[PDB]
Amino acid sequence: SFFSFLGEAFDGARDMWRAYSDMREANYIGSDKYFHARG
Amino acid sequence: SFFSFLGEAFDGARDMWRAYSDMREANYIGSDKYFHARG
Amino acid sequence: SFFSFLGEAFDGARDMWRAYSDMREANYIGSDKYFHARG
Amino acid sequence: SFFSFLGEAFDGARDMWRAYSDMREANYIGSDKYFHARG
Amino acid sequence: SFFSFLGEAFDGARDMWRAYSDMREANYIGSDKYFHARG
Amino acid sequence: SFFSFLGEAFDGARDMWRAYSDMREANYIGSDKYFHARG
Amino acid sequence: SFFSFLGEAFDGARDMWRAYSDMREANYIGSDKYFHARGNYDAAKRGPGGVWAAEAISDARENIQRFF
Amino acid sequence: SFFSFLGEAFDGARDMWRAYSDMREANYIGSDKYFHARGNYDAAKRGPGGVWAAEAISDARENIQRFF
Amino acid sequence: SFFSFLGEAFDGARDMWRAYSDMREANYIGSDKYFHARGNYDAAKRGPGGVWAAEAISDARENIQRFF
Amino acid sequence: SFFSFLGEAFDGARDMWRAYSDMREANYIGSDKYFHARGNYDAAKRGPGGVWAAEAISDARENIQRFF
Amino acid sequence: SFFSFLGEAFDGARDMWRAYSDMREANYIGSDKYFHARGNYDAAKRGPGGVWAAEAISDARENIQRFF
Amino acid sequence: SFFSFLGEAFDGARDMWRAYSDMREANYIGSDKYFHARGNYDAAKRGPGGVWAAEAISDARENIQRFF
């Protein structure tokens, strides 16, 4: 549960939760990045 | 459950939740990025 | 459940939830990006 | 549960939670990065 | 539970929790980085 | 439970918790980094 | 790029590749099955699935071969 | 890039690759099964799955071969 | 890059690779099964799975071979 | 890069690789099974799994071979 | 890079590798099973798993071989 | 790099490697099973696991071989 939130029976407040993640080029199962110069 | 929210029996407030994720080029199952210069 | 929201028996407030995701070039199952210069 | 939050029967406050993670090039199951210059 | 939070029956305060992690090139199960120059 | 937090029946305070971890190139199960120059 | 192949000079090749596959219910970017569903009885007899490959190479004076 | 292959000069190759596979319910970027679901009975007889490969190479004076 | 292969000069190769596989319910970037689910009965008879490879190479004066 | 292979000059090779595998419920970057789930009964008969390889090489004057 | 292999000059090789494997429920970067779950009964009959390899090489005047 | 292998000049090799394995529930970077879970009954019949290798090499005037 990446960057998840959970609560029960709770009162809130201003800016109670803030997340500032960066996921450029992320969460890659089998995607390769390669080159093959035989020349 | 990436960047998910969950709650029960809870009172809210201004800006109770904020998320600022960046997912450029993300969540790739088999999509490769390659070049093949035989020349 | 990416960037999902869920709640029950809850009172709201101004700006209770805000999401600012960026998904340019995202969620790619088999779409490759490649070039093949034999010359 | 990476960067997850959990609570019960709790009162909130301003900026109660803040996360500033960076996940560029992260969470890679089998995605290689290589080159093969026979020439 | 990397960088997780948990509590029960607790009152909050300003900036009660802050995390400043960096995960560039992190969480890699089998993704190699190599080159093979036979030439 | 790397960099985890846990508490019960506790009152908070300003900046009650701060973490400043760096995980560049971290958490690698089988991902090698090598080269093989037969030439 | 699943089951990718590359080559040069296939001079005289034979039977180079046999990609038998069952991609049923596959490649779903966004989807929700039985989302907010209550009381649904799911008895679909999806039955056999996947490859059921058989290959018999037999030389004889008399021969009897049966498949499936 | 699953089951990737590369090569040069396949001069005279035979039976180079046999990629039998069952990719059912695979490759899901975002999905939620039985999300917020209550009372759902799930009895699908998904049945056999995966590869069931058989290969019989037999020379004889008399022969009897049966598959599945 | 699962089950990757590389080569040069496959001059006269035979039976180079046999990649039998069962990738069912695999490769999930984001997913949630039975998320927030209450009372769900899950009896799916997923049944046999994975490879069930058989290979019989037999020479004879009389022969009887049976598979599955 | 699971089960990786590399080579040069496969001049006359035979039966170089047999990658039988069961990758069911594998490769999950982000996922949550039975997340926030209450009362769920899970009786799926997932059944046999993994490789069930058999290889019989037998020469004879009379032969009887049975598989699975 | 699990079960990695490297080589040069496979001139005349035979049966070089047999990578039988069961990667079920494997390779999980982020996941949470039965997270915040209460009362869940888990009776899945996952059943046999892993490799069940058999290899019989037998020469005879009369032969009887049975597998699984 | 588990079970790594390296070599040069495999001129005439045979049966070089047999990597049978059971990688179930393996390779977990971040995960939490039964996290914050209360009252969960866990009776999964995971059953047999790991390799169950058998290898019978027998020459005879009459032969009877049985596996599993």
Are K58 and L62 a contacting pair at CB < 8 A?
no
Tell how strand L32-33 and strand G41-42 pair up.
unpaired
Closest-CA residue to I64 (of E3, H63, K53): H63
Cα distances from B19 to residues B8, D32, E18, G20, in angstroms, run 20, 30, 15, 44
> Are G1 and C27 within 8 A, CB to CB?
no
Are I10 and G11 contacting, i.e. CB atoms less than 8 angstroms apart? no
Contact K21 J51 (CB under 8 A): yes
Distance, CA of K59 to CA of I59 (rounded, Å): 10
Q: CA A4, CA D4: separation in Å to the nearest integer?
A: 5
Q: How far is C14 from chain H (nearest CA, A)?
A: 26
Around H47, how many Cα atoms within 13 Å sit in the side-chain half-sphere?
10
CA distance C15 to chain I (A): 25
Put simply, whether D7 touches K (Cβ < 8 Å) is no
Do D and J make contact via 3 or more CB pairs under 8 A? The reply is yes
CB E30 within 8 Å of CB J1: yes
Give the C-alpha separation, G62 to I61, whole Å. 11
Q: Is C23 on the interface with H (CB under 8 A)?
A: no
Please indicate if any CB of chain E lies within 8 Å of the CB of I63. Answer: no
Q: Label residues G40-59 b or e (16+ Cβ within 10 Å = b).
A: eebeeebeebbbbbbebebe
B30/H29 Cβ within 8 A: no
- Tell me which chain J residue has its CA closest to the CA of residue E32: J1
Element (H, E) at G66: strand G63-67
Smallest Cβ–Cβ distance between H1 and the set A32, A36, A38 belongs to A32
Is chain H touching chain A, with at least 3 CB–CB pairs below 8 Å?
yes
d(CA J68, CA L39): 41
Evaluate whether L13 touches J15 at the Cβ level (below 8 Å): no
| Minimal-distance CA residue of chain J relative to H6 | J6
Which structure tokens are listed for D15? Answer: 């900026």
Q: What is the C-alpha separation between C17 and D1, in angstroms, rounded?
A: 22
Under 8 Å between Cβ of I39 and H38: yes
Distance CA B25, CA C25 (A): 5
Under an 8 A CB cutoff, do K30 and A2 touch? yes
Of I6, I16, I35, the CB nearest to J6: I6
Query: DSSP assignment, residue G30?
Result: S
Question: Cα(B9)–Cα(A9) distance, rounded to whole angstroms?
Answer: 5
Count, residues in chain L: 68
State the Cα–Cα distance between residues D21 and D3, nearest whole angstrom.
Answer: 8
> B29 in contact with D at a CB cutoff of 8 Å?
no
Alpha helices, DSSP H only, in K1-68?
none
Contact J22 H50 (CB under 8 A): yes
Nearest by CB to H11, from G3, G12, G23: name it. Answer: G12
Touch of E by B (3+ CB pairs closer than 8 Å): no
Residues contacting F39, CB < 8 A, separation 6+: E37, E38, E39
Strand partners, G63: H63
In Å, how far is F9's CA from the nearest CA of chain K?
20
Distance, CA of J11 to CA of L11 (rounded, Å): 10
A3 in J contact zone (CB under 8 Å): no
Q: Is D8 helix (H, G, I), strand (E, B) or coil?
A: strand
Residues I58 and I39: their CA atoms lie apart, in Å, by 54
Q: Resolution of this PDB entry, in A?
A: 2.6
Tell me which method was used to determine the 3D structure.
cryo-EM
Strand partners of residue L62: none
Q: Minimal CA–CA distance to H48: which of G4, D30, J47?
A: J47
Yes or no, beta carbons of D23 and A20 under 8 Å apart: no
Min Cα distance B28 → chain J (Å) is 11
Question: What CA–CA distance (Å, rounded) separates K55 from E33?
Answer: 37
**What Cα–Cα distance (Å) separates residue L18 from each residue in J20, K16, K19, L3, L15?**
12, 9, 6, 11, 7
Q: How far apart are CA D20 and CA D24, in angstroms?
A: 13
Q: Which residues of E touch K2 (CB under 8 A)?
A: 30
Contact between I51 and J20 (Cβ < 8 Å):
yes
Residues of D in contact with H6 (CB under 8 A): 36
**Nearest-angstrom CA–CA distance, I61 and K40:** 60
Question: How far is the alpha carbon of G52 from chain A, nearest alpha carbon, in Å?
Answer: 26
Write the Ramachandran bin of J43: left for phi over 0, alpha for psi from -120 to 50, otherwise beta: alpha
K36 vs D6: CB contact, 8 Å cut-off? yes
Neighboring chain I residues of K22 at a CB cutoff of 8 Å: 50
Which chain E residues are closer than 8 Å to L32 by Cβ?
1
- Is the Cβ pair L27, F29 closer than 8 Å? yes
List chain B residues with CB under 8 Å of H29. 27, 29
Whole-number Å distance between alpha carbons of I24 and H24 = 5
Burial of F33 (0-12, 13-18, 19+ CB in 10 A): exposed
